[PDB]
């Protein structure tokens, strides 16, 4: 069996496209966070961006990484335009605690959380 590939041939062009996409999100953050007038340092925004790239690092397929390139590309386009408002850009973060540490005992006090 075989698969029609989407964009890439192996993991290498996938890594190249995601690299370039991360460059694009890097040049996307400061101008837009001035334009929408949020409350977050450029360091914090960029570091949670590269945290989001750290979230999906273990993916071992060219197809899924190409599809994430499509995802990040669409999200980057509709944030570089002025469509996605202050609500959604702040919705990328978590300003609703959710402080829950991964202590077994702290999850045991207020329970049924295995």
């Amino acid at each position: 069996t075989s698969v029609k590939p989407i964009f890439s041939r192996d993991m290498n062009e996938a890594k190249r496209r995601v690299r370039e996409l991360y460059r694009a999100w890097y040049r996307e953050v400061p101008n837009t966070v001035h334009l929408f007038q949020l409350d977050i340092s450029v360091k914090q925004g960029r570091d949670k961006v590269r945290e989001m790239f750290k979230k999906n690092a273990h993916v071992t397929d060219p197809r899924v990484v190409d599809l994430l390139v499509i995802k990040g590309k669409m999200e980057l386009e509709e944030t570089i335009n002025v469509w996605k408002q202050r609500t959604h850009v702040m919705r990328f973060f978590h300003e609703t605690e959710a402080p829950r540490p991964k202590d077994f005992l702290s999850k045991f006090y207020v329970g049924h959380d295995p």
């Binding site: 409350d39 609703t96 605690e97 207020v110 049924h112």
Partner: protein
């Protein structure tokens, strides 16, 4: 004990937490944000308002469907207070105005009100009676406000002595008094509102921290004039009794713990001032840090 005081599941928005808070006043600033943290906890706020229905309307959908409840009260009677605290778990006392009126002044509110409500709360069987006070409110001179709150501390220690006396610093938030006083025109440590109210809700839901009075500390503690420099660097009712209150006393009290002993992380002035200082037109972050 009886059921439904046990919590269930997660917290907030029909995720039932286990406390029932009878909150006094709260139509102003700090009680409103504390109601917001209790609705974020998903609790039952019993609030008496003595006002027009419109202001409690604008704070109304903060809590969930029917978890809030509104009722009348006054600073003179007692039957309305007892009807308020019929079935209460805990109660917090936050009432007090920075200016004198015709019928009510600084005296007999801080001298009358916590006596009577602490009396009927001690009668009706509450726990964790949390009374607020200003930071460094003593019998020091030129401050009727500070000496009345100090007498109030003495009275809350007097009747129902197992009460949590708290003393937060000069708060700044979204609707600050003195910052907006600066918008229309000696170290000092101000502390942001969510640090204070997170400390309050953590001290009300983390028992063994009860009966011992607590104090809040601003994590800068520098000069008033450098703060005026910073706020006008970022920003491009005037009775001088207030200005004696903000010039008079600014010190630490190490006789009792603070923030990091409670389970609450501080936030400095600069980031929150970037948050609240809008209104440039229709950044010069100095922070000289005096001690």
């Amino acid at each position: 004990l009886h059921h439904a005081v046990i919590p269930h599941g997660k917290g907030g928005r029909s995720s039932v937490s286990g406390i029932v808070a009878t909150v006094f006043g709260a139509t102003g600033f700090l009680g409103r944000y504390l109601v917001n943290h209790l609705g974020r906890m998903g609790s039952q706020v019993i609030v008496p308002y003595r006002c027009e229905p419109y202001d409690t309307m604008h704070l109304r959908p903060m809590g969930d469907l029917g978890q809030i409840i509104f009722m009348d009260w006054n600073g003179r009677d007692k039957d309305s207070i007892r009807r308020a605290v019929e079935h209460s778990n805990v109660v917090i006392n936050l009432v007090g105005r920075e200016w004198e009126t015709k019928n009510f002044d600084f005296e007999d509110v801080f001298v009358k009100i916590p006596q009577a409500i602490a009396q009927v709360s001690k009668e009706a069987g509450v726990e964790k009676f949390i009374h607020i006070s200003h930071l460094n409110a003593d019998i020091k001179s030129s401050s009727k406000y500070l000496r009345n709150k100090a007498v109030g501390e003495k009275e809350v220690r007097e009747t129902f002595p197992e009460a949590t006396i708290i003393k937060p610093a000069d708060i700044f938030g979204r609707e600050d008094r003195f910052l907006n006083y600066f918008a229309n025109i000696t170290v000092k440590q101000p502390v942001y509102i969510v640090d204070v109210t997170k400390g309050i809700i953590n001290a009300i839901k983390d028992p063994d921290a009860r009966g011992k009075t607590f104090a809040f500390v601003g994590p800068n503690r520098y000069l008033l004039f450098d703060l005026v420099q910073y706020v006008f660097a970022v920003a491009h009712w005037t009775t001088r009794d207030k200005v004696e209150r903000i010039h008079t006393t600014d010190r630490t009290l190490p006789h009792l713990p603070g923030l990091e002993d409670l389970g609450v992380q501080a936030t400095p002035l600069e980031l929150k001032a970037i948050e609240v200082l809008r209104r440039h037109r229709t950044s010069e972050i100095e922070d000289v840090q005096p001690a």
